[PDB]
Amino acid sequence: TPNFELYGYFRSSCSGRLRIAFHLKSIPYTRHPVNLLKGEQHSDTYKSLNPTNTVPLLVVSNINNTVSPSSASFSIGQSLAALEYLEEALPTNARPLLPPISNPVARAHVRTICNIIACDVQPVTNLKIQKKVKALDGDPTVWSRDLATQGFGAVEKLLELSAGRFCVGDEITLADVCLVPAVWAAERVGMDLARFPITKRVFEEMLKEEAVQKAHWQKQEDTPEDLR
Amino acid sequence: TPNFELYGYFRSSCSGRLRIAFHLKSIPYTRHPVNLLNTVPLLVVSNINNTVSPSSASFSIGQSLAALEYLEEALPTNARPLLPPISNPVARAHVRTICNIIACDVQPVTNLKIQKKVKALDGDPTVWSRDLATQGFGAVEKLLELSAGRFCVGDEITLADVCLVPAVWAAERVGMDLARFPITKRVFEEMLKEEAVQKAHWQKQEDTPEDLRA
Ligand SMILES: N[C@@H](CCC(=O)N[C@@H](CS)C(=O)NCC(=O)O)C(=O)O
């Protein structure tokens, strides 16, 4: 079985996706905080680890690295690729986070929700983009609020078809894993979550989960005291 | 009613991802071009058992990465798997990471919607987009330094290549220098040799304006 080390940041939504998945699946992992406010993502040493200068970075070891056989480890620098790797590399794990492969329709619904969040909301509202907006003399908060609002609109329309207790029927999936940290992020920029009633119900359902609380941005080792 | 109908646009990179996949996997689809001036691409999937909405025999997929993986899973015996086998989760992960750099970190911040928002701030959407594409291609190039053979990962075409090609076409529009990414350029050029990629070429669609056919 593989060993896992996560380069993460308490307030990184993409990091939180992995934090949630690890706890849900009962997979132990080693924590390596990277301070994004201090620009530790920008150091040459971290660019060597992840060439996008982003967190999370998942470093997997005790495995056969089929891409670089001489390497003791394998690095996964994008959260959705890392989430699917947990699913594929640990097929006997007691808590699959996708519908079974015999249900490609449900799997596509789950992935569509993940992609709206990970493609259309997070990347255009992250720190790097907010800084580019500020450098143009725009308001990064309004920019981000408008884009998150629009993206949550798309998520809500999907949940109108798929949601039961959770995003897609009555079991937690990768959709819920992506939803929770995106809601934490959207709240930082003053998005009105009540405009999205199903999304809000499902988010609140997830907050009851011990796995989600263990994963909370306010409960990490690198959460500053003032934010705990 | 067609099994697959693609609401697409000749110059949409995300549409281009799906065109390349359908041609490479030889999956027939009905083309539904959509004018510039509403999700594009939107893949409408019909004649199915809808396990999410059972009173319906169809659904749509408005995100290209989800649509790509759906084609893999809905047609498991297709002659051209675009992921490495499930027995090789490392290679699958490396493929998906390259796809995600492009689909998460490049395309969405350099698309029409965001270029318009940049212009609305009196910014230069070309410089903005070239800057972001250059940064993401830097990351793609670093991954290909580890994995590339003939193609992005090893010597077989995968979803990494399918995402790579339309991203190169989009990046060229904003003046990105592809020569700065030499393995990326090499794999891009290898893909252009493919009949399936040519059939999928942004310059060779039914809705390509005549002045952009060459
Ligand atoms: N698509 C990437 C996005 C990674 C990303 O943008 N991470 C953010 C934190 S959520 C980051 O490290 N930001 C650094 C910066 O913007 O300077 C993924 O899914 O991992």
Residue numbers in the entry:
A (entry chain A): 3 to 230
B (entry chain B): 3 to 39, 55 to 231
Please give me the paper's original passages concerning this structure.
A 1.85 Å resolution crystal structure was determined from a crystal grown in the presence of 10 mM glutathione (∼10.7 equivalents relative to protein at 0.93 mM). The structure was of a different crystal form to the apo structure and contained one dimer in the asymmetric unit. This structure revealed the presence of glutathione in one protomer, again revealing a nonsymmetrical dimer. The glutathione-bound protomer was ordered from residues 3 to 230, whereas the other unliganded protomer was ordered from residues 3 to 39 and residues 55 to 231. The distance between the Cys16 S atom and the glutathione S atom was 3.7 Å. A sulfate ion was observed in the same position off Ser14 as in the apo crystal structure, again with Arg190 positioned away from the sulfate ion (4.6 Å). Considerable movement of some components of the active site relative to the glutathione-free form was observed, indicating an induced-fit mechanism for cofactor binding. This is consistent with binding studies on human GSTZ1-1, which showed half-site glutathione binding even at saturating glutathione concentrations and are suggestive of a cooperative mechanism.
Crystal structures are presented for a putative uncharacterized protein that shares sequence similarity with ζ-class glutathione S-transferases (GSTs) in both apo and glutathione-bound forms. Each protomer consists of an N-­terminal βαβαββα thioredoxin-like fold common to all GSTs as well as a C-­terminal α-helical domain. Based on sequence homology, structural similarity, half-site glutathione binding and sulfate ion H-site binding, the protein investigated here is likely to be a ζ-class GST/MAAI. Glutathione S-transferases (GSTs) are detoxifying enzymes that appear across a wide range of aerobic organisms, including bacteria, fungi, plants and mammals.
